[PDB]
A paper describes a structure:
The 6-bladed β-propeller Ralstonia solanacearum lectin (RSL, pI ∼ 6.5) was selected as the model protein. RSL is a rigid, C3-symmetric spheroid with high thermal stability making it an interesting candidate for protein-based frameworks. Here, we describe protein-calixarene composites obtained via cocrystallization of commercially available sulfonato-calixarene (sclx8) with the symmetric and “neutral” protein RSL. Cocrystallization occurred across a wide range of conditions and protein charge states, from pH 2.2–9.5, resulting in three crystal forms.
To this end, the P3 cocrystallization method (incubation of protein-sclx8 mixtures at pH 4.0 and 4 °C) was applied to several chemically modified or mutated RSL variants. The introduction of an additional Lys residue into RSL was in some cases compatible with the P3 assembly. Previously, we generated the double mutant N79K/T82Y named RSLex.43 These mutations introduce a C-terminal feature homologous to the macrocycle binding site at Lys34 in the N-terminal blade. Interestingly, up to 10 equiv sclx8 caused precipitation of RSLex, indicating that this protein was more prone to macrocycle-mediated assembly than RSL. At 15 equiv or higher, the mixture was soluble suggesting that the protein is encapsulated by the calixarene. Crystals grew within hours, and the structure was identical to the original P3 assembly. The new potential binding site at Lys79 did not interact with the calixarene in the crystal, suggesting that additional features are required to switch on complexation.
Numbering used by the authors:
A (entry chain A), B (entry chain A), C (entry chain A): 1 to 90
The structure:
């Protein structure tokens, strides 16, 4: 019933994203240098991990959301979240 | 009752920090290239995530410690741990 | 009984590694730019975290696998997984 978080950051400002899995829902809080605000990420799951990388100045984020034994990858390449190709056989 | 960890690293040596949430307490183990040792971070919580970034050679660490549904951000900018501005409405 | 994951990435392609702790076993799924595939990492544990760093083009990965209150570090320096020096007194 307690929340679980994952965090990533990029740059030097920096940008920070914190993902919280809470009661089956994963949401996102954002820092771009001046105030926390709610991000666009909203996906179901009880467990979350995240990684991100820059290509030049363009950020790419991958969030691994799991429900039960099933993990779904969600992708941000600057133009909205979409489901990635990740599969596992858990 | 089992522990949960989070890890971050920086540089090429590298520096590694491993945070362990255990029985409501989060502690920190450190590697700077030659031996593990206990770090200054000590904060309550049952769940931990971490991210870090360099500005030049200066490391900045953010630890997200959660108890129940409440997440507190702890900040290291080289001069002691202090509570950050992070809020969420879980 | 639900899975828990950790993720790391490097480069710009990028390379991604996703670790899944499931029913006491931690396994690894890999992306090197074109298709997910199963990695060599197989170690016991109920909880996983990971960090990685590059030295030039050489990747180094550290996986922190925990069972109960005992955390074991596993190391990849490009030539097979081996147990690291990490200790904690949980
Ligand atoms: O500026 C906020 C935002 O656009 O940053 C990139 C991603 O984290 C998005 O989910 C998020 O809404
Ligand atoms: O462009 C999306 C994608 O190819 O990005 C890299 C990996 O995250 C893949 O699983 C994912 O489908
Ligand atoms: O050298 C150890 C240390 O100073 O490194 C930076 C932070 O991880 C601190 O909590 C820690 O005590
Ligand atoms: O200087 C501290 C601070 O501004 O650093 C960036 C973010 O971690 C903020 O939540 C935090 O208050
Ligand atoms: O190319 C896959 C692989 O060699 O990548 C480096 C490590 O993640 C290994 O466990 C893994 O088998
Ligand atoms: O070469 C292996 C090693 O020295 O790498 C750095 C740290 O991960 C240590 O715990 C580990 O034993």
């Amino acid at each position: 019933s307690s929340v679980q978080t994952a965090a990533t950051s990029w740059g030097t400002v920096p940008s920070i994203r914190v993902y919280t899995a809470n009661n089956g829902k994963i949401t996102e809080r954002c820092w771009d240098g001046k105030g926390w605000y709610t991000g666009a990420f909203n996906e179901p799951g009880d467990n979350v991990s995240v990684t991100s990388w820059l290509v030049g100045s363009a950020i790419h984020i991958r969030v691994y959301a799991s429900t039960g034994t099933t993990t779904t990858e969600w992708c941000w390449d600057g133009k909205g979240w979409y489901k990635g190709a990740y599969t596992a056989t858990n």
